[PDB]
Amino acid sequence: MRECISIHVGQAGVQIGNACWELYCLEHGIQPDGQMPSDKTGDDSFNTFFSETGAGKHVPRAVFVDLEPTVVDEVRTGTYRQLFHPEQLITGKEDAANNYARGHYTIGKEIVDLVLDRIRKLADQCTGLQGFLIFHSFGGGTGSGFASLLMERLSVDYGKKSKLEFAIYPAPQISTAVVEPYNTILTTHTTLEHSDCAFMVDNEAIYDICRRNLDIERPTYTNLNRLIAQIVSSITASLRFDGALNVDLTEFQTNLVPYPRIHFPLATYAPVISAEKAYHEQLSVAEITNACFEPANQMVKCDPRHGKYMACCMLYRGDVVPKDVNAAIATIKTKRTIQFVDWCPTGFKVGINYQPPTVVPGGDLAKVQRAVCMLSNTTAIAEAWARLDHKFDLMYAKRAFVHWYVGEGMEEGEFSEAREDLAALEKDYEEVGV
Amino acid sequence: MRECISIHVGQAGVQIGNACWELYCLEHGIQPDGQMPSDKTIGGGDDSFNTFFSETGAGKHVPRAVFVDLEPTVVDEVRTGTYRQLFHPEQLITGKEDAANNYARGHYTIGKEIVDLVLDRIRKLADQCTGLQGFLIFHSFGGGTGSGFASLLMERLSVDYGKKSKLEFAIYPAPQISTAVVEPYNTILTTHTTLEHSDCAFMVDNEAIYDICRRNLDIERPTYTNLNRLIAQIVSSITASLRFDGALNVDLTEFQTNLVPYPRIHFPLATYAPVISAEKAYHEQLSVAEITNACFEPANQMVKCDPRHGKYMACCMLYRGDVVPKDVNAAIATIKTKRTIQFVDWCPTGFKVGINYQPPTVVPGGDLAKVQRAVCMLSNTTAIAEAWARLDHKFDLMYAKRAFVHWYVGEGMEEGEFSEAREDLAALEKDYEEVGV
Amino acid sequence: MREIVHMQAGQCGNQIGAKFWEVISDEHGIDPTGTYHGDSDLQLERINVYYNEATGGKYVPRAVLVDLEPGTMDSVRSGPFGQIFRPDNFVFGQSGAGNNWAKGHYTEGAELVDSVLDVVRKEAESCDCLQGFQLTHSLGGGTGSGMGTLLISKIREEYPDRIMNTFSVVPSPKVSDTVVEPYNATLSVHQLVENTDETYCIDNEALYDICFRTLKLTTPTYGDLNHLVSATMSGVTTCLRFPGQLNADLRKLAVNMVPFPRLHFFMPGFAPLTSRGSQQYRALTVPELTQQMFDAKNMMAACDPRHGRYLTVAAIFRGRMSMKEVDEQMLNVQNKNSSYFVEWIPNNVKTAVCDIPPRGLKMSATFIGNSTAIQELFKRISEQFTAMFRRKAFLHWYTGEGMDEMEFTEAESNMNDLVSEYQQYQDATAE
Amino acid sequence: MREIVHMQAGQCGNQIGAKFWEVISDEHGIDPTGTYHGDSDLQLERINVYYNEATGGKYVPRAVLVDLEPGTMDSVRSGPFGQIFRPDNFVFGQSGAGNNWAKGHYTEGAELVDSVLDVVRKEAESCDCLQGFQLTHSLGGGTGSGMGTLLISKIREEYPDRIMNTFSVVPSPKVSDTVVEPYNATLSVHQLVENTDETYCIDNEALYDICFRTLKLTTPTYGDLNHLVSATMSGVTTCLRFPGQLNADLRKLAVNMVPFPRLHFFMPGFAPLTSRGSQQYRALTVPELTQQMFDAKNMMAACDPRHGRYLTVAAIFRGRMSMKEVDEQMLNVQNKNSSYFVEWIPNNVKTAVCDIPPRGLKMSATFIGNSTAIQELFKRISEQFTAMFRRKAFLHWYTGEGMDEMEFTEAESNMNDLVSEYQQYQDATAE
Amino acid sequence: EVAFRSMVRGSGLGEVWTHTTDLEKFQQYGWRTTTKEDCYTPDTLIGNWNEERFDIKRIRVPKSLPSQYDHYFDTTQKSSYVSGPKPVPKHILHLAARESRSFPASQPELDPPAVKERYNSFETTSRASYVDPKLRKNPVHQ
Amino acid sequence: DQRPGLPKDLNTLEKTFGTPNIFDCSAGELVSPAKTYQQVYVESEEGREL
Ligand SMILES: Nc1nc2c(ncn2[C@@H]2O[C@H](COP(=O)(O)OP(=O)(O)OP(=O)(O)O)[C@@H](O)[C@H]2O)c(=O)[nH]1
Ligand SMILES: Nc1nc2c(ncn2[C@@H]2O[C@H](COP(=O)(O)OP(=O)(O)OP(=O)(O)O)[C@@H](O)[C@H]2O)c(=O)[nH]1
Ligand SMILES: Nc1nc2c(ncn2[C@@H]2O[C@H](COP(=O)(O)OP(=O)(O)O)[C@@H](O)[C@H]2O)c(=O)[nH]1
Ligand SMILES: Nc1nc2c(ncn2[C@@H]2O[C@H](COP(=O)(O)OP(=O)(O)O)[C@@H](O)[C@H]2O)c(=O)[nH]1
Ligand SMILES: [Mg+2]
Ligand SMILES: [Mg+2]
């Protein structure tokens, strides 16, 4: 009755979806061919991610979409070939070349109807859809233009239902591309007004977490995507399994978004640990709650102590006794390092689930009794917005890399409008903070 | 001694009879082979099956039914399935060509050769009787053998047997849910012919039983088997007075004399209504007042018409099981004091009740629960005038430009028979307003 | 125990008839030698409708193959499932018509008419019920069109009441393939419209469109089109062969379909159709079959039903399903697309649910549509005919056989009359 | 007949109702198959108060379980004592309010409330003398503060003569556990002031303190809190259920406690409470029971009795005990504590002793206390409401759904009037 | 929203076909012969290579051992999400002939026995429901 | 490589790390113990003679 549709936009979204669906098949006991191992000895928790087209086979409620047919072709020829729906792996022909204009105006206008028809068929098969989980990046092209185009063309059709966004936000001092400031400025102006909860995960933050808490000095994107897959599994395990008081995709909007223009929390899955450290540790509720407010165990590279906490959503998973959560939150409230905003005496949404987390054979995380995922709305993101504002101003001072957008179809004033929208967002964050 | 002959004509009739006779075998304890597997048997009083079965003198029972269809597939399904040795091979009457949803083919040309053979078989069954209680005709108004040949057979029976009970159970079309195009032509033609040759015309609607199965039994996607089982339960509740001993036994003659006020108002409504499923059946009291109030509900009629738009004239209440008369009297008093149930001004004594000892039996291949108390409500009222008007609307808007008429015209029937039938059913409607006012 | 005699005329008729007799023999569990190897009894219950009993467990198809040249008869007998036919039902001559309707209907066809009528009379008197005749041929050919319509006329003269349906591979707008195809098609349909009870009008370009857009297969070849046509023929005739909840034979379809006797040109459609990669993932449900059945480019006629208005519709479902969902979906599609159905016929959709799914599938549906969109095909053939005829092109071949231009002018008049009847019904108002 | 229609709304309400039905079926001897296997007929003598005899002499509770999503509803059905509930009374939605009082009161919560009113109309019609209605929900939550208060309003309109006793869980001073608790709590208590006859508020950290201190329990999770509240649930109805020396029904308790119609928020308390190790060291007598009742560590609400005045005390004793034991133990408490009781009500303790103790206890006692100590909890919730409403945080959901700021201001003003009435009757002197 | 559309149909990779009108259908994919994405082996990733590799004639042949110089061709989404070689079943590899199909490319060999039994057992409603009412009070076991 | 920090044999993904939650003497056997009425009457009439 309670199902979610996972749209994966861009190469990063497709690889995140690879890790996420591997984890989903693992924790629901689904082989890569789509079959249960039977074994006789009533599980039904898959009926939020796996449509049971009745033959003994379960198919995902996922739409992989991309313009470049490389990473989706890797999925289509890889190990999860006989599991995904063949007409749910939508690919274009041309790439997008980190161009918001080529992802929103030129290449993607002939394929948006196809991806929306697949989404419409999935929703018509669905029977009480909570919402969509859209995995993408603000790097550019498909993840910037096409994902935003999906935001308007899904909000104008459906509305109402949740649209949770998993953005790979650009890092402060490092990145891969160069026009990511332009793409990130252009994405938010068209994505902000049509969204419900759009939270961000940063590459430097995962690199620090993997190098420190996991002792992976040379981590690839596989560890990053697995570590985000654990976050999404912990954010939907309340919908999937039973437990204590449960937080579905409806309270995520009304408990984390105080004002309509500010919907930007931060993830924090923080019993992140390796085998030796977990062997010598006795991981308990107070420790795993105190490990979530540390600036080292943050999923974005920002400064949380130079900011005021708006709201928090605790998602506990495993052998969690409820009063230990309340004692941990009481200790956090008496702590001075964590600062809350004044118009918020009550500021936590606590939800406990009984299902222990699952470990992937071959990986980095260890099997642990307890898990905590914070969804924390704070005012610390204004520093990141200000530094990308500075990057955009430096690149737009003498019209660097503008001719591509202008010749592709983007109007010159669109950059100014997105600049004004980000300036309004900075003023909104300042007014909230004061 | 109180014996009835069942004539199941058409594919719908054959399928409804296939459900009805397995219900009868389950009720009387007869195995599908034809004998009683009671082994110890014991005499006592064991003549309850004589309404529908006859001794062969060797322990086998053959039913008093004739299965008629002009095409050889739905009867051969019966002859091939597990109820093969139960039926006598001569009662399974089949043709060569089907009547092709055509009243003319069913009534004039193809129906003219096999009518003599089926009349001969009915003659043998009537000779194998010690006093015939009546005929139970089962057909569909949808078209073909169930519409043309049924009218031909009942007019031949009216010529031959004369004064006899002629209860029919008609599959009337729904306002929207139907599977044919020339079906309103077939209905308009058959309601003109079977109006003066019948005495009770119990009407059931496919969409209405669909809504019943979707609401009460909560069968979202049912087949014809469930609908046939519900119709069989209705017919079993009707014939329970003839078959099993009870306190107040309402036979066919008592039923008609208490039901029909006029000879052309012989069109009642049936509602057997403990109809809830075995899941949500054993958490409720299921009292006599409860099941009577379930019968007297607008969204329980098994023909698609709202009884609040009309006036009740007669009601017959057939109770089944552990039913005491004081609860019957209290329930009837509450129904009479209810104001949304309007009775017509000229019928003060609007109820005729009758209680049978035997409880309903559960069919293991079905979905109705093993209830202890049952009531089947048969009301003669004026709420079917809107169904008649919808049928007239369909017939008029097709007959305005003479669509599909050439199949009837060039194969027997003349052109003006449609006009005559429309005039006859308009007169029937006018009769219904004269009785209603 | 009904009977339908199958007749194949021409190269197209012989090829898709051979595919038909492959598919229904696989349905009834008959090996290519002729014996019965089925595992059930419902296959053998109604095997007499198309197979005459022979010595032992052999089962001879009730098919008559006719073509003036032996070039396709030798191939259709030597191919797979070709040794099951009776060798006496393979009538052939010396010369060939070859897109020469005049030769197929008047000079070379007329010599073989006596022999093929003797064979068909032999089969019909071997029958004991004889529900009707099905003829498979192609409009736009010599032997299929001309001699096929001549056989249609002779069988209508012999038996004026037994049912008759022609499957009628029809010309397409852009495939063409023949320069005298408008002449052959017009002269054949002039006979068909007055001498046929059910014309089905299957289109080659439409079949390519279905087989490529729905089934992928960038090499859609020839036997695949034969397989699609055979699937539709089997889905049409399945109620005569198998038990079901609500059976409907060819005469029930004709009565519920044809409002007026000249409006009998249909649009076939088979719709549990899915791609090779999508078979293990798709759910064969009744609403989904209804959607694919009423899908516009799932029609095997090249004419779009959106450019018209449906008069009558038949849906032959096969498999175990729920009647409530079936007719509820027909109610839903009528109330949604009420602008594409005539307002003066209520319940435009007849239903026929049989309980035996086709082999290899769980649940199927066959579509018949008597839409007024086939007037586009008729107008296309009319305009090509009047483009060729106004310059007297290719007419000496036809007039050297004993034919005059009066027949061509009559064919113009009859096709234009039929166009007028289809034209006025899509816009005639009730009141 | 004295029947109470029971309702569970929200996740907390559904779980605590399931635990209450488990413990009351344990008290009345009903097994998970709905039959009776008790030892004394006194369990059967007044089954009709909450159960409903089906066919075969089985018993089904008169409980309406409602939630906007199938969640805890399915958990209750799959758990123990789940098949005893009527499947018709498992009314559910498909959407989700989720801490969204506007959505639980004006969206899909407001259309399924017609079905819930129909269910309670059937349950009340199938009775002879209804005592009243009780409902379990949670202020500061989702659907419990939404559909729960809507149900209270509509049922009070339908039957404005029956005793209405909401239990409800109020928000906790320590921890947060939901951010919109002040908004939902104010909007729910604005309905609960004028509609409900009596409310027995539950507070989660008070339950945590009473589990950790007076029973140790290490980790009792949520089910044992539900059990320890269900003890008081049965405790203040056991005079209506079982006979005894002095009987006090719900109406008698309501008139004997409530001084003025606004003043009807009580604190429950169960006090044969022992730890595991001290149960063999403690002696169970009526003075010890009264000591544990009037102990401030047994208060189920976030309230300090020392910072306030007890308006009225109700004491439901269970077991075989003397009468002036109870009478003198309340006389002694009143004489020892003259500064914590209101001076204008002489002997404000209402005592009632029943003859049947609960399971496993020789004697037991339930304390229900109407005080002015609720003022601190309500001024906490009011100041939190003002703190959020000054900056209009989390208000856009409610306003963009359809309520306005006027409703919030009226709710805040009404609850401030309630606080002012508490302070006025606390500070009012006798003469 | 057009009326008689069931589902928009995509091309081998990205192109959609105009379901409304048939005017450019000979320059859409398929009928277009100026292109080249039709005459390659299914190893290459153009055309409907997925649907060609989903065919029986490519499933029946199994994969070989990895070559010597496969470490130069190892991939992150081949070494992270590790997969064993697929043990193609004997009832597929020893397929003598295609059994009774119904439409082109209607391959029922890959279907599991749970759905194969549904059409291999001739399920008719009257016989299936009006069976002896003593075998329906308890289920039958294999 | 994670081996010499861990013990000699430990199958990493098979052993759960952290502390368990011991579950004894819940309030269901403290608030309302299952001791009927005759048993608690006997256990309470023990004593009284002294
Ligand atoms: N966390 C994570 N981030 C990734 C991964 N792969 C790519 N990225 C991010 O994606 C950015 C590169 O641009 P993409 O988002 O991949 O662009 P795209 O979505 O493929 O769309 P195009 O413009 O057409 O290439 C890098 O800066 C990375 O931060 C991944 O596997 N995990
Ligand atoms: N309730 C119910 N109605 C049925 C059943 N079978 C057929 N019908 C009705 O019958 C109508 C179709 O006409 P048929 O009764 O099958 O016609 P026929 O009696 O077989 O006679 P022919 O048309 O000559 O074959 C449909 O509209 C159905 O409503 C059934 O099993 N139960
Ligand atoms: N769909 C389909 N069309 C065919 C087949 N064989 C021939 N045709 C078409 O039939 C037309 C030629 O008709 P033809 O067979 O030569 O008629 P004949 O001369 O009487 O044999 C051509 O346009 C072909 O496209 C076939 O097996 N399937
Ligand atoms: N005593 C008790 N309280 C609970 C339980 N589950 C949730 N709660 C309380 O219920 C409040 C939240 O209400 P909620 O269940 O979300 O309302 P809903 O959204 O309508 O289901 C919180 O303050 C919890 O303290 C439980 O099992 N027992
Ligand atoms: Mg890319
Ligand atoms: Mg029939």
What distance in Å separates the CA atoms of residue B38 and residue B49, rounded to the nearest whole number?
14
Among B116, B69, B115, smallest CA distance to B92 is for B69
Residue A103 Cα to chain centre, angstroms: 20
Extract the tokens encoding A170. Answer: 């650009």
Beta strand A309-318 pairing with A370-378: antiparallel
Q: How far apart are CA B180 and CA C257, in angstroms?
A: 10
User: Could you tell me where the DSSP H helices lie in A137-281?
Assistant: 147-155, 180-191, 203-212, 221-240, 251-254, 275-280
Contacts (Cβ under 8 Å, ≥6 apart) of A40: none
Name the pairing type of β-strands A89-91 and A62-66: parallel
DSSP element (H, E) containing A376? strand A370-378
- Beta-sheet pairing, B312-321 with B351-356: parallel
E29: left (phi over 0), alpha (psi -120 to 50) or beta: beta
- Give φ, ψ of A163 to 5 degrees: -130, 85
Q: Kind of pairing, strands A62-66 and A59-60?
A: unpaired
Q: Which residues of A are catalytic?
A: 251
Residue among A197, A311, A346 nearest A260 (CA): A197
Contact flag E130-B365 (C-beta cutoff 8 Å):
yes
F20–chain A Cβ distance below 8 A for any pair: yes
Phi, psi angle pair for B128, to nearest 5°: -85, 55
Q: For ligand 2, is residue B180 a contact (CB within 6 Å)? A: yes
- Determine the number of helices (DSSP H) and then strands (DSSP E) in chain B: 14, 12
Residues of A with CB under 8 A from a CB of D: 1-2, 127-128, 130, 242, 244-246, 248, 250-251, 253-255, 257-260, 311, 321-323, 325-326, 329-330, 342-350
Q: Are A356 and A146 in contact (CB under 8 A)?
A: no
Q: How far is CA C228 from CA A302, C16, C300, E103, in A?
A: 63, 9, 9, 6
Say which residue the tokens 């195009």 belong to.
B181
Alpha helices in C132-222 (DSSP H): 148-158, 181-195, 204-213
Residue E102 CA to residue E62 CA, distance in Å, equals: 27
Q: Identify the CA nearest to F27 among candidates D224, D361, D210, D230.
A: D224
D247 C-beta neighbours (distance < 10 Å), count: 15
End-to-end CA distance of chain C: 45
Q: How many CB atoms lie within 10 A of CB F4?
A: 8
Which atom of ligand 2 is the closest one to the Cα of B228?
Answer: 32
Which ligand is nearest to the Cα of residue C172, counting in written order? 3
Q: What is the number of other CB atoms lying within 10 angstroms of the CB of residue E21?
A: 10
Are C256 and C198 in contact, with CB atoms under 8 Å apart? Answer: no
CA distance B106 to B100: 8
Strand order in the sheet with C163-166: C90-92, C63-67, C4-9, C132-136, C163-166, C198-199
Residues A3 and A127: beta-carbon distance below 8 Å? yes
Query: Looking at ligand 3, which atom is closest to the CA of residue C145?
Result: 20
Q: Is D33 exposed, middle or buried (0-12, 13-18, 19+ CB in 10 A)?
A: exposed
In single-letter form, the type of residue at position A170 comes to: P
> Could you say which DSSP state residue A355 is in?
P
Cα gap C368→C362, rounded to integer Å: 21
Distances (CA, A) of F47 to B404, C285, D160, D357, E129: 101, 75, 53, 20, 71
Cβ(B10) to ligand 2 under 6 A?
Answer: yes
Residues 6 or more apart whose Cβ sits within 8 Å of residue C359: C26, C27, E99, E100, E101, E102, E119
CB contact under 8 A, A92 and E13: yes
Determine the Cα–Cα distance for residues B256 and B261; give it in Å rounded to an integer: 9
Contact D176, A328 (CB under 8 A): no
User: Tokens at residue B424, please?
Assistant: 């006859």
Name the amino acid, one letter, at A1: M
Burial (CB count <10 Å: 0-12, 13-18, 19+), residue A142: buried
Instruction: Find residue C364's DSSP bridge partners.
Output: C318
CB of B106 closer than 8 Å to CB of B148? yes
CA–CA distance, D63 with D86 (Å, rounded to integer): 8
With a Cβ cut-off of 6 Å, ligand 1 is lined by A 10-12, 15, 67-68, 95-96, 98, 137, 139-143, 168, 175-177, 203, 221, 224-225
Closest Cα partner for B123 from B163, B49, B64?
A: B64
Rounded CA separation C381/C173 (Å): 9
| DSSP H or E segment with residue D374 | helix D374-390
Which residues, at least 6 apart from C56, have a Cβ–Cβ distance to it below 8 Å?
C35
Contacts of B277 (CB under 8 A, 6+ apart): B216, B217, B218, B367, B368, B369
CA-based angle B100:B102:B108, to the nearest 5? Answer: 110
What does the CA dihedral A165, A170, A175, A177 come to, rounded to 10 degrees?
Answer: 70
Q: Tell me which ligand sits closest to the C-alpha of residue B98.
A: 2
E contact residues 34-53, partner A, Cβ 8 Å cutoff: 45, 50-51
Contacts 24+ apart (CB under 8 A), A47-54: A47/A1, A47/A3, A48/A2, A48/A3, A48/A4, A48/A236, A48/A239, A48/A240, A49/A3, A49/A4, A49/A6, A49/A24, A49/A236, A49/A240, A50/A24, A51/A122, A51/A125, A53/C281, A53/C282, A53/C283, A54/C283, A54/E115
Spatial separation of the C-alpha atoms in residues B325 and B331, rounded to whole Å? 10
User: DSSP letters of D85-102?
Assistant: S-GGGEEE-SS--SS-HH
CA dist., res. D147 & res. D168, Å (int) = 13
- Do chain B and E touch: 3 or more Cβ pairs under 8 angstroms? yes
Residue with tokens 């034969």, as numbered in its chain = C226
Is there a contact between C257 and C247 (Cβ–Cβ < 8 Å)? no
Helices (H) and strands (E) in chain D, counts: 16, 14
D89 CA to centre of own chain: 21
Q: What's the alpha-carbon Rg for chain B, to the nearest Å?
A: 21
**Terminal alpha carbon distance of chain D:** 44
Residues ≥6 apart with Cβ < 8 Å to A177:
A98, A139, A140, A183
DSSP secondary structure letter of residue B105: I
Concatenated DSSP letters of D281-345: T----HHHHHHHHH-GGG-SSS--TTSS-EEEEEEEEESS--HHHHHHHHHHHHHH-SSSB-TTS
Rounded Cα–Cα distance for residues B351 and B335 (Å): 10
Run of H or E residues at A385: helix A382-396
In 3D space, the residue among B189, B6, B18, B180 whose CA is nearest the CA of residue B111 turns out to be B189
Of D217, D273, D360, the CB nearest to F33: D360
> In whole angstroms, what is the distance from residue B428 CA to residue B422 CA?
10
Task: Return the structure tokens found at B124.
Answer: 């043998």
Dist CA C328 CA B177 (whole Å)? 7
Q: Give the number of other CB atoms < 10 A from CB of residue A342.
A: 10
* End-to-end Cα spacing for chain F: 71
- What residues form DSSP beta bridges with C6? C63, C134
CB-based contacts of C393: which residues, under 8 Å, 6+ apart?
none
What positions of B carry a catalytic annotation?
Answer: 254
Q: How far apart are CA B383 and CA E126, in angstroms?
A: 34
Query: Within 10 Å of residue B238's Cβ, how many Cβ atoms?
Result: 23
Cα separations in angstroms, D372 against B170, C169, D209: 73, 92, 21
Q: Is D234 exposed, middle or buried (0-12, 13-18, 19+ CB in 10 A)?
A: buried
Instruction: Please give the full DSSP string across C64-88, using - where no structure is assigned.
Output: EEEESSTHHHHHHHHSTT-SSS-GG
How far is the C-alpha of B67 from the C-alpha of B48, rounded, in Å? 23
Task: Render E43-71 in DSSP notation, one character per residue.
Answer: TSSSSSHHHHHTSHHHHSSPP----GGGG
How far is the C-alpha of D287 from the C-alpha of B365, rounded, in Å? 65
Q: How many CB atoms lie within 10 A of CB A392?
A: 19
Tokens of A354: 């009984």
Report the residue of chain B nearest E138, measured CA to CA: B364
**Cα separations (Å) of F26 from C393, C409, F20?**
101, 100, 16
- Evaluated on CA atoms D375, D381, D383, D386, the torsion sign reads negative
Measured in angstroms, the resolution is 3.3
> Ligand 1, closest atom to CA A206?
1
Query: Each residue of A224-253: b (16+ CB within 10 Å) or e?
Result: bbbbbbbbbbbbbbbbbbbbbbbbbbbbbb
Cβ < 5 A residues, ion ligand 6: B 11, 98
